[PDB]
Ligand binder design. Sequence first.
Ligand code: BCL
Ligand code: BCL
Ligand code: BCL
Ligand code: BCL
Ligand SMILES: CC[C@H]1c2cc3[nH]c4c(c3C)C(=O)[C@H](C(=O)OC)c4c3nc(cc4[nH]c(cc(n2)[C@@H]1C)c(C(C)=O)c4C)[C@@H](C)[C@@H]3CCC(=O)OC/C=C(\C)CCC[C@H](C)CCC[C@H](C)CCCC(C)C
Ligand SMILES: CC[C@H]1c2cc3[nH]c4c(c3C)C(=O)[C@H](C(=O)OC)c4c3nc(cc4[nH]c(cc(n2)[C@@H]1C)c(C(C)=O)c4C)[C@@H](C)[C@@H]3CCC(=O)OC/C=C(\C)CCC[C@H](C)CCC[C@H](C)CCCC(C)C
Ligand SMILES: COC(C)(C)C(=O)C/C=C(\C)CC/C=C(\C)CC/C=C(\C)CCCC/C(C)=C/CC[C@@H](C)CC/C=C(\C)CCC=C(C)C
Ligand SMILES: CCCCCCCC/C=C/CCCCCCCC(=O)OC[C@@H](O)COP(=O)(O)O
Ligand SMILES: CCCCCCCC/C=C/CCCCCCCC(=O)OC[C@@H](O)COP(=O)(O)O
Ligand SMILES: CCCCCCCC/C=C/CCCCCCCC(=O)OC[C@H](O)CO
Ligand SMILES: CCCCCCCCCCCC[N+](C)(C)[O-]
Ligand SMILES: CCCCCCCCCCCC[N+](C)(C)[O-]
Ligand SMILES: CCCCCCCCCCCC[N+](C)(C)[O-]
Ligand SMILES: [Fe+3]
Lengths: 301, 281, 241
Amino acid sequence: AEYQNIFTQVQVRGPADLGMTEDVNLANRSGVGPFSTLLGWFGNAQLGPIYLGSLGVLSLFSGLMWFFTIGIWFWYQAGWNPAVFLRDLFFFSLEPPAPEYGLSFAAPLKEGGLWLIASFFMFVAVWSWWGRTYLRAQALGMGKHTAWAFLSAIWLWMVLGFIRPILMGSWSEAVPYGIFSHLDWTNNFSLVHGNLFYNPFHGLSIAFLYGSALLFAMHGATILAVSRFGGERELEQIADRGTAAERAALFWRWTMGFNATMEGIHRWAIWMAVLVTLTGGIGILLSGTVVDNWYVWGQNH
Amino acid sequence: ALLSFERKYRVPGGTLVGGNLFDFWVGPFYVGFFGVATFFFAALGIILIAWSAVLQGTWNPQLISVYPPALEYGLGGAPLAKGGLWQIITICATGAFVSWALREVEICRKLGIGYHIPFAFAFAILAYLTLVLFRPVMMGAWGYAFPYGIWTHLDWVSNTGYTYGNFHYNPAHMIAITFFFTNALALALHGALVLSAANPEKGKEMRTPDHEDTFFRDLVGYSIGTLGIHRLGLLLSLSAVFFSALCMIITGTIWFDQWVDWWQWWVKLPWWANIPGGING
Amino acid sequence: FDLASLAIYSFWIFLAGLIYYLQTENMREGYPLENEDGTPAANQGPFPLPKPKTFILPHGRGTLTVPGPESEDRPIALARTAVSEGFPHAPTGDPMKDGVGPASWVARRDLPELDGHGHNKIKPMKAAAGFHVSAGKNPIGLPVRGCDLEIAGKVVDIWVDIPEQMARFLEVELKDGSTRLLPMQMVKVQSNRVHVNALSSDLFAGIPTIKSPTEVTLLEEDKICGYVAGGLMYAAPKRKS
Ligand code: BCL
Ligand code: BCL
Ligand code: BCL
Ligand code: BCL
Ligand SMILES: CC[C@H]1c2cc3[nH]c4c(c3C)C(=O)[C@H](C(=O)OC)c4c3nc(cc4[nH]c(cc(n2)[C@@H]1C)c(C(C)=O)c4C)[C@@H](C)[C@@H]3CCC(=O)OC/C=C(\C)CCC[C@H](C)CCC[C@H](C)CCCC(C)C
Ligand SMILES: CC[C@H]1c2cc3[nH]c4c(c3C)C(=O)[C@H](C(=O)OC)c4c3nc(cc4[nH]c(cc(n2)[C@@H]1C)c(C(C)=O)c4C)[C@@H](C)[C@@H]3CCC(=O)OC/C=C(\C)CCC[C@H](C)CCC[C@H](C)CCCC(C)C
Ligand SMILES: COC(C)(C)C(=O)C/C=C(\C)CC/C=C(\C)CC/C=C(\C)CCCC/C(C)=C/CC[C@@H](C)CC/C=C(\C)CCC=C(C)C
Ligand SMILES: CCCCCCCC/C=C/CCCCCCCC(=O)OC[C@@H](O)COP(=O)(O)O
Ligand SMILES: CCCCCCCC/C=C/CCCCCCCC(=O)OC[C@@H](O)COP(=O)(O)O
Ligand SMILES: CCCCCCCC/C=C/CCCCCCCC(=O)OC[C@H](O)CO
Ligand SMILES: CCCCCCCCCCCC[N+](C)(C)[O-]
Ligand SMILES: CCCCCCCCCCCC[N+](C)(C)[O-]
Ligand SMILES: CCCCCCCCCCCC[N+](C)(C)[O-]
Ligand SMILES: [Fe+3]
């Protein structure tokens, strides 16, 4: 049995790493948490610290208010019976206003108004979390790549719940808050729009979603295969190419005729993943606003 | 031509079959016995696709479609024009893919690196073999496999899914999707993290791995670590494909109803099935 | 030709530009391509060399500009086996000692990698205050067995990546009382031994040595890691099936 470095053989532990300071406001940084031997079999054992800050607490408060608003609706849909609650948990749904209400905020609480309230809180939670991904990198002197990639996910979410409903003329077009109901919404969306398999932006989204798993399996396996030369220390390999980076590249050059660098593979990676929701958001935004029926549209083009 | 650092790695050795007979390169590509095998399987498969396109009457790659035998052929062979070509092409594709993986193993050995990559690729091959071999054999007919056409295999996914109602309710399918989404989330985050450390703010020195750990700890309270994230990406992508193969190998073999029935066990548990109210009462 | 048609054609143009950008970005190392005799190749393909970018390295380590003039910065004991291109290049000496093929190393900086505070990233556990084995079999004190199934020495310390709290090397004491570093990813810790498939016991002393007992440079890591991995190919005649 050759060792494969998927799980750690010998865990080691020292003083907790408190991290870099740079321009981080240490007033808003928690203390360090405990160590998890369980996690240490696969990754780092140390938990914490975490940064709080005004945007974090606003995001947390608002995100919990979103979760609680849905929850309270679920208890009401369950007649406040805890057993009915647990039984139908995945079947409850906080639904948007009926189409008659259009984009009005006057829909009564029990027939769409609570959906709007939950959506307001979610909108605040995500966008303040986005601000947080930006400000955490900036406090550390780092590039803004995480906030920019996160924007691509936010783009699809904004299209589904906000932009497309407004362009279609009613909140009724938006996704409901429930486990099974949002799945039923997804199925219905495709049927209503003439088979989403023929939305070319949907086919691209799939190419990049499959391609993300293809690429991360490739890259994850490649870095493990060269971890015997310190391959996972990618920053110093970028600064000072080692035999790890060279063998990783030549494996792929010899296999498929071209290859990456230790830096450039992470550009391939960030675009492969970002393009999933970028093309996806375009695909959904055009559905119903421009194209009613993707299959018919495809046959005429 | 070589990369500037490549010559020192182009030594003899590492082959599994043939000794040094195939131990050479064509431009950047390594050959090896399984490179030759790959070429033979792929070239023949492509020739038989061209043959099937000639019989079909189209050179349009968006219309060419190689269909498996009608279900009535069961697991038997079929005439070339009526499923046989699909059958031989499937053998050629399996041969090319397995030859590809074993070629990678020879490349792994010449370069002295671990075998993680062809091992990972083997999961994709097993997912392909689930759809065209393992599931059709267990269902009793090649005709349950998917056709080889750009749009027609999408119609196959649609037809197969809706045979079971909304295929979303397949629970192994739910797990696979969760791994697919989480993998893309992890890939986006990992690419962003490295690039944000290597390309810091203007006016800054290149960051260190400690900045990456600190960023992710500040953000969510945990940093999995540079080794951990590559293990994680490999596990997420492989698990997505494992649960994909699992969600299909059970569909039509040990599960035949609308998938939305599976969860209805939870619904009609005797102690709360008949409580008036809610959704399931 | 409506907005969806305009969108999809536009996206494909963007994608072609993105792939061209991504490929050129990934030519910042190893290009331009060379002939097998080291001179520039005539055919470089259709993607042009990227324009230089600079990394300002921390801790006073200077700047990297890539692409830049490239050099192995070390002798390569290999000779052509053929006049035409595409055939293997054969080691002229001892490939393990000369660091070629799967024994290859790169002329990295002869300095240790530093953490974010400017301290050595890797240290022997005896020099890393508070570090200890926290789970799994502690290999210290165990004998180290080679692929000839004979003992080559004893584990005397673990070298740890401090920021990632990770065992990276086993320090192994040989018969003459010197020590070598063994990559943690190339050993299997068992209850009564550390087994190293890559090397036979007679090859452990050939592992390149480090100049200081409490630190290891990137150059030295590359030489150790290359040598040990090179044993999978070159110590195979000594490997019992
Ligand atoms: C996996 C579960 C389903 C299925 C569901 C879907 C759905 C749903 C969609 C696709 C889509 C595609 N699928 Mg499919 N697909 C299946 C099995 C396959 C197999 C196979 C041998 O198993 C192949 C080669 C393909 C290939 C393809 C491409 C035509 C396209 C983009 C995929 C992509 O980028 O992936 C990630 C891989 C990469 C980024 C690497 C590059 C891959 C290239 C693009 C593959 C080209 C193959 C070529 C056209 C055909 C054979 C070439 C031979 C030389 C003859 N599918 C099975 C039956 N597939 C999408 C599409 O737009 O279809 C029109 C789409 O919407
Ligand atoms: C019957 C169903 C229909 C269909 C209907 C749809 C619809 C409808 C949509 C998709 C979409 C997608 N589909 Mg489709 N789909 C079908 C068949 C397929 C098949 C297949 C093999 O059959 C595949 C592989 C796909 C694949 C895909 C994806 C590529 C794409 C979603 C990308 C993504 O990451 O979303 C996941 C990511 C997000 C939703 C973004 C989330 C970001 C936000 C900001 C997260 C906030 C978190 C929140 C605050 C909670 C925090 C919790 C705390 C952490 C605890 N579909 C059929 C034809 N599909 C989407 C798309 O883009 O279409 C173009 C879409 O809307
Ligand atoms: C893309 C087209 C469709 C769609 C199609 C599908 C399909 C199809 C599937 C899912 C699946 C899921 N989707 Mg959905 N999904 C859509 C948009 C969303 C949005 C959103 C803000 O837009 C959210 C929060 C979710 C959330 C979820 C989860 C319940 C689940 C796993 C997601 C995942 O892997 O995330 C990656 C992210 C992480 C791992 C980070 C942590 C995320 C946590 C788990 C999110 C918690 C959500 C919710 C608040 C939890 C309540 C649980 C209990 C009820 C208390 N979907 C759009 C409208 N989604 C799968 C599933 O299991 O369904 C049951 C599935 O099969
Ligand atoms: C109406 C359609 C149904 C439905 C019906 C089905 C059916 C039916 C199936 C899936 C399957 C899957 N679906 Mg579904 N699915 C639906 C909605 C969704 C949604 C969504 C957002 O709504 C999502 C995200 C998914 C997601 C998924 C994945 C879990 C899985 C596809 C990945 C896979 O199998 O890879 C596995 C990867 C491969 C098969 C690729 C293998 C490639 C080989 C090894 C190499 C090819 C080389 C190539 C030829 C070389 C070309 C030349 C070179 C490029 C140069 N489905 C709806 C409800 N879904 C499939 C599955 O699980 O299959 C196992 C499947 O069969
Ligand atoms: C490129 C596209 C991919 C992607 C990218 C992406 N997502 C991202 C990012 C990026 C680059 C981030 O930077 C950001 C992040 O921080 O990641 C760690 C994020 C993220 N993507 C997330 C989710 C997500 N991403 C998804 C998808 C994807 N994201 C794509 C595949 C999906 C789906 C459906 O596939 C999901 C579900 C989050 C983990 C995070 C955004 C965090 C956010 O906005 O949070 C706002 C909400 C809160 C702060 C709190 C919510 C409250 C909880 C729901 C309640 C939990 C229960 C609690 C115990 C109750 C108890 C209360 C009591 C204690 C009082
Ligand atoms: C298991 C995790 C993910 C994964 C991993 C993975 N794939 C891999 C690898 C890895 C680690 C490789 O090492 C290998 C590689 O070299 O990548 C560059 C490969 C690879 N994955 C590929 C494709 C691919 N991977 C996919 C998926 C995934 N790959 C998973 C999601 C998908 C889809 C649909 O999601 C596709 C299309 C190739 C780029 C490459 C394998 C190349 C190969 O095998 O080459 C030898 C064969 C040929 C050159 C041609 C064979 C031709 C056939 C004889 C005829 C055609 C038959 C075919 C069935 C017709 C299909 C028609 C379609 C319209 C449906
Ligand atoms: C134990 O019980 C208690 C009460 C304690 C609980 O808290 C339990 C709680 C629960 C059981 C919660 C269960 C929650 C869920 C099942 C949530 C499920 C959510 C999803 C599946 C999400 C699906 C997709 C959601 C989307 C796409 C939403 C997009 C919305 C945004 C774009 C925001 C749009 C903004 C609007 C409409 C507001 C406008 C107002 C402005 C000021 C801009
Ligand atoms: C209207 C038509 C559809 C448009 C949809 C737009 C939705 C929102 C999209 C966001 C763009 C996300 C893609 C960017 C990902 C790549 C990130 C990256 O590599 O950035 C490098 C650099 O540059 C920024 O870093 P900094 O210079 O450090 O800020
Ligand atoms: C027929 C096809 C013709 C195609 C011709 C081009 C079409 C238009 C294409 C547009 C895409 C251009 C490349 C987009 C990628 C973004 C480039 C980029 O981001 O550059 C800045 C980046 O370094 C800074 O990143 P960091 O250094 O990581 O901060
Ligand atoms: C206070 C205690 C709260 C603890 C809360 C735990 C929940 C957070 C889980 C994160 C999983 C990891 C997400 C994936 C990370 C991808 C980004 C990456 O590349 O990380 C690399 C490494 O961390 C540096 O190099
Ligand atoms: C903190 C609450 C956030 C409110 C933002 C969304 C407004 C929706 C109000 C629901 C409508 C109730 N009303 C008054 C019509 O009955
Ligand atoms: C950044 C990685 C680039 C990978 C590009 C993948 C292209 C896949 C083509 C899928 C075709 C989809 N569609 C419907 C337009 O035909
Ligand atoms: C669909 C994603 C695949 C993108 C294909 C990128 C092809 C790049 C080939 C570059 C050739 C490098 N070479 C051989 C000149 O050194
Ligand atoms: Fe990486």
